[model samples]
Structure formats: structure tokens, C-alpha cells
Target: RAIATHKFRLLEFTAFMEIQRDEIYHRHLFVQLGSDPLLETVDIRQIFDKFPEKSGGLKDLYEKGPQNAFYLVKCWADLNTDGDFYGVTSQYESNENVVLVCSTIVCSFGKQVVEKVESEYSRLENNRYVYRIQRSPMCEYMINFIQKLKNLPERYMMNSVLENFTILQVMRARETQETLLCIAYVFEVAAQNSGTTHHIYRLIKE
Candidate 1:
């Protein structure tokens, strides 16, 4: 729950700056994600608190995740074909910013990531969401059920791997909300030995 909230706060902060983007104040103010990898990000909003030292620096680069413990799985889907696939999963956003959520489990990423983020937003929208969640482990129930259908032994191994795109599509969904998580990874997915994999369908999770 806490993870969700902190992440949203970060997203909202970034969105805050994105909306006011222009060549005026922003042109002067410089920014850097962070000093290291995995450990990156800064709430541009902080600029308001106390501007930086003209192109110099701001206290220091703010790192989000730990550098040593940090790792990202870039969710790049089948670009061409007969290529190697890496990462936890694959999710593509269209020119329209539509989230193309797919998965053979190993690649399709998963809807729960979207759900987990939403659950966090729901909690922020109302603390009761957490408590009232009569709330039960319905997400698990529903996902598990979905899993059975997506996973067919005969055909595609389908939905066997729900990558943690929980953050990817969450941002995709966020783009829709103006629309946004913290947990992030970017890797690749190697297609099945049989042949290359393709998206089953395309739809914005929102």
C-alpha cells in the first residue's frame, strides 16, 4: 500500500511539471534523473520549493531505487522477428499512448500490475478502499481464473508470465488519466523455440 502511494506521489509530481512545460522558466532550470541508475527520479515540483543554482546542481541528484539492488527489465516486444526476447514481459504503447497489454506469461506482462496501481490509487482516493477491500483478495481470485483460460497446454503457454509491467501499463493508464507507479524494469523477452510471438490483441487497460 505504501509503495503504491509513494509511487503515485512521484508520478503526480512529474505530471505536475509536464503540464506546465514551456521554454520560459523551464529553459533556465536544468534537471537530472539521478546520479546513478535504478536510482533515478526527482519531483520537478521541488524546483518551486527553491530554484537551483543556475545550471550548477540542486543539492544533488535524487535517486529512487538503490543502485546496487536496482535492475530494470525493458519491456520491448517483438520489434522484428527471429530476434531475442529478454526482460520480465512485453507491453507496447501506441502513437495514441494506448497501452497494448499482452502476454504469453513470459512476455504479455499482465493486468494485475494495472490493478495493483489502481488499488493504490483507490486507497488514496479513499483509505477505506484498503479496509473495505468485503472486500477480499478478489484480485487474486480473478487473476487466477484468468490465468487458467489464458494458459492452455495444447496451444500457447499464454499468460504464464505476468511481468511486473505493473508499473508500465500503470503509467500507460496514467497517460489516459492525463493519465499514470514506482516499480519499473526494462529487459527483453526471448520468443518461444517454436517461433516468434505476436500480440494476441491490443487494448488500453484504462
Candidate 2:
């Protein structure tokens, strides 16, 4: 929850700079945390004061599993069998939509990768020594789930969109941890500025 929220807030801050100030808000603290990875102490009192009823929101987010730990990172093979990466957007108009798009693209990538790997090996009629490492049903599940999420009308549910752009910050950052966290934000901006607002499928798997 923290990582996902942080990614969103950071993206939002870089994309929208007004939220970086002493005034405490989820958006505020989020920017602060992202701007400075190490903080002396978070202003929890300020956070709770703004939304007194949000402890549940915090706890609920916390309860969500590790997938929420960071933005989704995916690699899929293209028609020419090239690998590409997609990161979930945190700063889009809707986080749910952002996740939804991320998931769908991942599913699409899984499908392509599965097909590519399958094409590399021969079918085993009866011999079992070196059978093809067939694609897992999870590949289908991911792709299907992504499609389902994209079609759903809900705003808060997780969905997917494909992203095929090269991750520049992955190369720019000094270390793996910084690069991992910052690269997603870098990708998010590229998506937002793309001027392609077809929310059904913003990130390109193609």
C-alpha cells in the first residue's frame, strides 16, 4: 500500500507540483516521502486530523497484499520476440484505472510470451524426456482478467493497460532500489502526456 501510494503520489507531484508543502494531506505527505526517501518522522497527527475517519482506509490499504507493495513491473515479447516493460501509473486521474490498465497489459504480454516460448519447442506425442515447457494457465488468467477489468464499469477496482516504452530512469538511477521506485514515476508521466485518453487501454502493449 505504501509503495503503490507513494508511486502515485510521486507521479502526481512531479506531474502536479502544488502539493509539496508543509500543509499535511495524503497528497502532501506522499510528495514529501517521494521527494525524500528518508524522513525523520511522518506527521501522523496531521494526516489523521485531515481525515479522522481514514484509519480504516489506511488499514484497508495495509491489508492489501504485496502486489500493492509497488507498481506492477512486466516484461513481454513483441511480434519480433523483443522484451518490453510496463509499470503501473500512480498519478493518473484514477488509481484503480491505473492498476486496471497495468494488469491488462501484463495479461496481454503474458499471452505473447507464452506463444513465443511454445513456438520454440516441439510437441511431444508420447515421449516425455524433453517435453515443451507449456505455458501456464496463469498466462490466460492474467490476460482474461485484464480484459474483464477493462470492461468493468467500476472506478475503484484494479485494471490493466499495456506499456511498451523503454524505462529510461532504470538506467539513470544510481542504484536498483531508487531506479525501481523512480522508473515507474518516469513511465507514468510518459503515459499521461501521451495525449491518448482512451481510458479503456491507455498503456500500449503493442
Candidate 3:
């Protein structure tokens, strides 16, 4: 039957799964958050909700309950053919609300968004096009810290500018149709041994 043949064809997709397995099997240099013992913690949600307007009312965007927490696995990369920085997260799933938040931040903080294109390249022998993807000198010091995770400073300061941010719930920038690449996050900052802590919601767009 056609259905039986379709099911058999599905098993042929094993090669795709193999590619994913390759990543986990490979060992790479990495660091962990627990590496620094001096870090402390606080509830960032308090600060996030305090100024809903400046935070772009992002708190209300998600359903009231536990939300997915993701970590920055890699630095912003030149995934866009136009050459912009974008941080990749650990998760692969997203929705319209996520795009809305990301776009809002990009509009507010992005330097200049240009048209985005998907990159493509050929594979030797395989004969196919493979497409894949995967930041600043702050005052120079902060720039280095943010762009690279190798040597992060003890304390970092970021601007707390706009709160009520909003981006149209669309996949691309209005008119331009450029891919929306923005990430919204609630950052936790605690002063080492200072007993001072603050949480800020920011958009990371390159």
C-alpha cells in the first residue's frame, strides 16, 4: 500500500538524525556558569515588571505560568547574508509572540537593519547546496567582553532606556521583508559581595 511505502520512506530519514548525533558525540572546549563562585542571584522578574512600559510590556506577552528558560550557547554570528550579529539560543522552537518581542528590540536597539538573505554553498562530491549560519568594542573593554565569552569581567553595566517596546507580529521588517533577528532576555546582574542586584530586559540584535 502507498501508506506502507510512505512509512518505509520515513525510515530513510535516518541520515538527518545522524547529523544531529554527530554534534553530541564531538567534544569541544566550553565553560560553565558555575565556574565563577562569586556570582549571586536574585529574581529578575521583579525588576522586569516594575517598569512594564520600558520593558515593552514583554511580561504580558507570554502566558502566565512557567516559561521556557534558555541559555546563550554561542555568540552572535554572521548568519544573515547582510552581515549582522545575532545570538543563537539553545532552543529551536519559537512562535509569533517570540517574533514580536525580538522585532521590537531590534527596532529599538539595532544600528541599521539591512535586507537578509539565506547563505548557500556547494559540497564537494555530494553535489548540493548547503546553507548554514551560525559585535563590538564597547568602550573597547565591554565590547570585548560581550563579543567573546573567553574573558568576561566581574561586573558589567548596560543601558536601561525604553520600556514600552512593541514590534508588529510579523516575520519580516515592514516593507523590506528583511528577516527579523532579535532576541529578548531578562538579564541578571549582581554585584559581587556588594549586596546589590538588578534585572533588566533587553533586546540583543546586531
Q: Which candidate is the best by TM-score?
A: 3
Worst 10 residues of 3 by lDDT: 8-17
What's the lDDT for all of these models? 0.24, 0.23, 0.23
- The candidate with the higher TM-score, 1 or 2, is 1
Q: Candidate 2: misplaced stretches above 4 Å?
A: 1-12, 15-37, 43-46, 52-56, 59-206
- Using lDDT as the measure, name the better of candidate 1 and candidate 2: 1
Model 2 TM-score relative to the real fold: 0.18
How many steric clashes does model 2 contain?
13
> In candidate 3, which residue ranges exceed 4 Å CA deviation?
1-45, 50-56, 63-206
Report how far residue 14 has shifted in candidate 2, in Å.
3.6
Q: What's the CA RMSD of model 2 in angstroms?
A: 20.6
Q: Estimated TM-score per prediction?
A: 0.19, 0.18, 0.23
Give residue 52's lDDT in candidate 2 (0 to 100): 14
